[PDB]
Write a protein that binds this ligand. Structure first.
Ligand code: P0G
Lengths: 58, 339, 234, 284, 128
């Protein structure tokens, strides 16, 4: 019990520390995800299936 | 009545964080990703089948050349394969038969393993004298070693069943810093591409984001229902996925501090063992206990295809670091490489 | 071409050596019989392993390799590491007999047993049951301050079965109680009814005869009943 | 008569049953890696043996009874007889091998998994096919097995099988009698152990139907191999002892009765759950 | 997040009755096998009673056969434990813990603290 109140104290310090950050908008974050995907989409071998002439595993 | 006031203030704090997160939710990725074209039924086929093991495969890892791969099995054998020409470059017998993890050095020097023997054994491969010997054995956990990964050839972070994570240094063999603050067994971890920070899954259904240099937890994500088996980053580092035993995959953003999306389907009752993205970051591959490997999309959440195969559960999954192929280990001792 | 061909030949030889040694490993490995020893708490599981780390023990009887593993060095949050052992042929489950009074870790052990028996990966693994601390059980029961019937009321309705094998100098109530615990573990095993795996009870360590002989007979039985049931003769 | 179509349709169903069944078994073991066990290598041998049984042997034998004269030539008739004997011997022997496999499993469990490996399995398969060839082809191609005999031999399209005493006794003893004895002793001792185990289980479960479950499976596995081939192989030893004790139609009839056992084999040996799954996955 | 809140409980005469309730949320309550686990004062924990998915399969520890009635409300995600005719041995902290795995029969929960799928508990005390 007395060993647990120290754990509770530490948890209050943890919640205290992670309470104060910056959070950005979901619309912009997801927009960044969409942008990265639409950028690197051409270099993806799983996405555009591989020609067997240039396929290293054939 | 001290514990009561403390728990009240802690719950209140939690409530404030809950509300602050709920306030940032002005749209969804599901709403805005309407115009993005779908994937289509795009399917993979087995180009190579690597068989060498006597017992079940518990893990694998790709190398940075995308050529070699290490796989460990519960017979105590560690086989280092070659992807193209399906050979066996090395076989290292372990001290303990049971091994739950393996890792590859980014420069190709060392290979790490670990398991219920509580000790992370580093093996050198560059021995001019010949075969492989234990280079440095790292012991600091009171529980089993669930997973671990190389930062570089010098320092290595480990995860364990004694609720903790630890960053080691190979030369001194000691713990540089100790990460505590999880609740249950720490099942898996994943490094960053810039390796400044790393996430970890645990048995309290919550994934934590730590920072490697300072050693502090920046954010705690509570979105799942049960134990989180695997966690994998995204190509730019701003998001990550977690599989769990609630039969759902979830995508979390770090700058949004909350769960963005859940991929699930009602015909699933079993957990997700492993996850990973592709090179571009568009596909989310997940192995399940229904013996398949379901390929989801990261944007539209519809499964594009499926990977048939293994006769028993799929333990591990990995993607080549240039994105050229996928590899799936199972409990039928067989590795299948796909394209 | 010029030297890749040599790489092919080198890697070929390495593959040969590894393949060879691995084949030699398969024989000893598949001939080795893996066992999982576990107990709830104050179980006397350290005596059998007194009869690699301190965890693992490999003992040899009649040129038949046994490879035991003790999990006593881990935490009791069990649900992740116990999946690692699905190839183990038998789980030796050792429980104290007079721990009914104080708590009731006998009920905890029963719970753990049911959990293992119904777990979805361990639906194939037979449990060899060792009922320990027989004399101590007898003492507590004859002393009578510690009553089983408090924590098991249905013991008032359970009498000595027809297949009684009494050893003399013993209270028939003590014998009845002993068989009652044994039956409490058996009924859980018979609840499933598929017959893929079975529970073999035993009585232990009041006489310190080597329990390996029981282990032996029961291991033989497990594998014999695996082939027997698979060939539909059972 | 109506005899032509009456027998033709039945023999067509037999040829189709044997072929379709054994082909299905082979393709299942080829297109599933889970079916690649040591026991399954044995059943693959059995399947091949029964496949060549219903592909050449039984159709040309049917053509022989319906047209009652062969056109294809003398050499090809002895060859045909050879491939017949080869398929039969290989079948029976393989059945005996599988029986010995199960006896080794239940009698010596600890040494079972250790000894019986892949190379050992292949060695036994090749051994079986060698003993079957050495008890069929060499006597026929070397003419060790020989009035009416010389007549039918020298006559081209006389498609009769006349053997001397020395070849018929030893040929039958090698293909059938020894495997029968082995199988009887094997399943007997196995049944004894099974009965014992059921006794122990009954002692530890206080919670005749199981005896029935144990007798039925042995009864059918021995019965299908007995009823089909026993009257034939007994007929050969009666035909050697006392001539004109058996008419020539009975011989052909019994031989066919024996052939059908090859068609029953996939049904009495693919009762696995996994076999069933793998079967319906190919039959949609 | 996941929390299970023990409500009810308090100081009651032996031979009385007390209805324990547990409000759950953050998960699909219909699927998860719930159970009640106790921790005695100054002695280790012992499992008491479980309830399955449908509300059919119900077991008790032998000490509390029949006098305890465990019932689940799937319709609003809430759990209930009806205790009747209390005994002096019952005085302990009653936690409502769920089993961690979906769609199963096994549970590993009586195992001690920093197990997240367990509440803070209420105090039930036997009167003098
Ligand atoms: C040539 C012909 C002409 C007319 C009608 C039928 C046939 C077909 C025949 C009788 C040859 N089938 C033989 C049958 O398969 C057979 C196989 C293995 C054996 O070990 C023997 C055996 O029978 C004889 C023996 O003693 N042993």
């Amino acid at each position: 019990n007395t060993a647990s109140i120290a754990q509770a104290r530490k948890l209050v310090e943890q919640l205290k520390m992670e309470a104060n950050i910056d959070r950005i908008k979901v619309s912009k974050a997801a927009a960044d995800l969409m942008a990265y995907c639409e950028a690197h989409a051409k270099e993806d071998p799983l996405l555009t299936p591989v020609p067997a002439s240039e396929n290293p595993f054939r | 009545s001290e514990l009561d006031q403390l728990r009240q203030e802690a719950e209140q704090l939690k409530n404030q964080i809950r509300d602050a997160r709920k306030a940032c939710a002005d749209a969804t990725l599901s709403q805005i990703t309407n115009n993005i074209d779908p994937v289509g039924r795009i399917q993979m086929r087995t180009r190579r089948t690597l068989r060498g093991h006597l017992a079940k495969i518990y893990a694998m890892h790709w190398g940075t050349d995308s050529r070699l791969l290490v796989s460990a099995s519960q017979d105590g054998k560690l086989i280092i394969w070659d992807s193209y020409t399906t050979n066996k470059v090395h076989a290292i017998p372990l001290r303990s038969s049971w091994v739950m993890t393996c890792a590859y050095a980014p420069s190709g020097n060392y290979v790490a393993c670990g398991g219920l023997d509580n000790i992370c054994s580093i093996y050198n491969l560059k021995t001019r004298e010949g075969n492989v010997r234990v280079s440095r054995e790292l012991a600091g956990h009171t529980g089993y070693l669930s997973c671990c990964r190389f930062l570089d050839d010098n320092q290595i972070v480990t995860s364990s069943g004694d609720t903790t994570c630890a960053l080691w240094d190979i030369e001194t063999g000691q713990q540089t810093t100790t990460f505590t603050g999880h609740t249950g067994d720490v099942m898996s971890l994943s490094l960053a591409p810039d390796t400044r920070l790393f996430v970890s899954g645990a048995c309290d259904a919550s994934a934590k984001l730590w920072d490697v240099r300072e050693g502090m937890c920046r954010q705690t994500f509570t979105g799942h229902e049960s134990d989180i088996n695997a966690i994998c980053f995204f190509p730019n580092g701003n998001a990550f996925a977690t599989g769990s035993d609630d039969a759902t995959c979830r995508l979390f953003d770090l700058r949004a501090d909350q769960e963005l999306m859940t991929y699930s389907h009602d015909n699933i009752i079993c957990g997700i063992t492993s996850v990973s993205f592709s090179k571009s970051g568009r596909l989310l591959l997940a192995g399940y206990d229904d013996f398949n490997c379901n390929v989801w999309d990261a944007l539209k959440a519809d499964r594009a295809g499926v990977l048939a195969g293994h006769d028993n559960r799929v333990s591990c999954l990995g993607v080549t670091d240039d994105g050229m192929a996928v590899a799936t280990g199972s409990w039928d001792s067989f590795l299948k490489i796909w394209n | 071409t010029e030297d890749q061909r040599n790489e092919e030949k080198a890697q070929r030889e390495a593959n040969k050596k590894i393949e060879k040694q691995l084949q030699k490993d398969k024989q000893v490995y598949r001939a080795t019989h893996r066992l999982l020893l576990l107990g709830a708490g104050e179980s006397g599981k350290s005596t059998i392993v007194k009869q690699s780390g301190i965890f693992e023990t490999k003992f040899q009887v009649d040129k038949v390799n046994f490879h035991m593993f003790d999990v006593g060095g881990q935490r009791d949050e069990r649900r992740k590491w116990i999946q690692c052992f699905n190839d183990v042929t038998a789980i030796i489950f050792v429980v104290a007999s007079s721990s009914y009074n104080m708590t009731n870790r006998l009920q905890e052990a029963l719970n753990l047993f049911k959990s293992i028996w119904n777990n979805r990966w361990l639906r194939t693994i037979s449990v060899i049951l060792f009922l320990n601390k027989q004399d101590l059980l007898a003492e507590k029961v004859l002393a009578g301050k510690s009553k089983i019937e408090d924590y098991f009321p249905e013991f008032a309705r359970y009498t000595t079965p027809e297949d009684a094998t009494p050893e003399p100098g013993e209270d028939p109530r003590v014998t009845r109680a002993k068989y009652f615990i044994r039956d409490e573990f058996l009924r859980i095993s018979t609840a499933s009814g598929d017959g893929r795996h079975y529970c073999y009870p035993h009585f232990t360590c009041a006489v310190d005869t080597e329990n390996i002989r029981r282990v032996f007979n029961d291991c033989r039985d497990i594998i014999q009943r695996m082939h027997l049931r698979q060939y539909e003769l059972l | 008569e109506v005899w032509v179509v009456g027998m033709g349709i039945v023999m067509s169903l037999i040829v189709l049953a044997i072929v379709f069944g054994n082909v299905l078994v082979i393709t299942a073991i080829a297109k599933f890696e889970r079916l690649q066990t040591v026991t399954n290598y044995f059943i693959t041998s059995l399947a091949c043996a029964d496949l060549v049984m219903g592909l050449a042997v039984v159709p040309f034998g049917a053509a022989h009874i319906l047209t009652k004269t062969w056109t294809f030539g003398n050499f090809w008739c002895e060859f045909w007889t050879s491939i017949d004997v080869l398929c039969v011997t290989a079948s029976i022997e393989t059945l005996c091998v599988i029986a010995v496999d199960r006896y080794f499993a239940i009698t010596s469990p600890f040494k079972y998994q250790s000894l019986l490996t892949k190379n050992k399995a292949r060695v036994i398969i090749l051994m079986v096919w060698i003993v079957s060839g050495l008890t069929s082809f060499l006597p026929i191609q070397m003419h060790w097995y020989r009035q009416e005999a010389i007549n039918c031999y020298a006559e081209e399209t006389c498609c009769d099988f006349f053997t001397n005493q020395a070849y018929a006794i030893a040929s039958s003893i090698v293909s059938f009698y020894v495997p029968l004895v082995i199988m009887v002793f094997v399943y007997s001792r196995v049944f004894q152990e099974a009965k014992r185990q059921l006794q122990k289980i009954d002692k530890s479960e206080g919670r005749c139907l199981k005896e029935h479950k144990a007798l039925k499976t042995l009864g059918i596995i021995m019965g299908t191999f007995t009823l089909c081939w026993l009257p034939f192989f007994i007929v050969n030893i009666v035909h050697v002892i006392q001539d004109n004790l058996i008419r020539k139609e009975v011989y052909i009839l019994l031989n066919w009765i024996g052939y059908v056992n090859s068609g029953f084999n996939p049904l009495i040996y693919c009762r696995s759950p996994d076999f069933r799954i793998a079967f319906q996955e190919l039959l949609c | 997040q996941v929390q299970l809140q023990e409500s009810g409980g308090g100081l009651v005469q032996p031979g009385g009755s007390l209805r324990l309730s547990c409000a759950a949320s953050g998960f699909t309550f219909s699927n998860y096998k719930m159970n009640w686990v106790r921790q005695a004062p100054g002695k280790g924990l012992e499992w008491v009673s479980d309830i399955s998915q449908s509300g059919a399969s119900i077991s008790y520890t032998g000490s509390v056969k029949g006098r305890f009635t465990i019932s689940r409300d799937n319709a609003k995600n809430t759990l209930y434990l009806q205790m009747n005719s209390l005994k002096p041995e019952d005085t302990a902290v009653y936690y409502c813990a769920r089993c961690p795995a979906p769609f199963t029969r096994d549970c590993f929960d009586v195992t001690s603290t920093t197990y997240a799928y367990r509440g803070q508990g209420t105090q039930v005390t036997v009167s003098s």
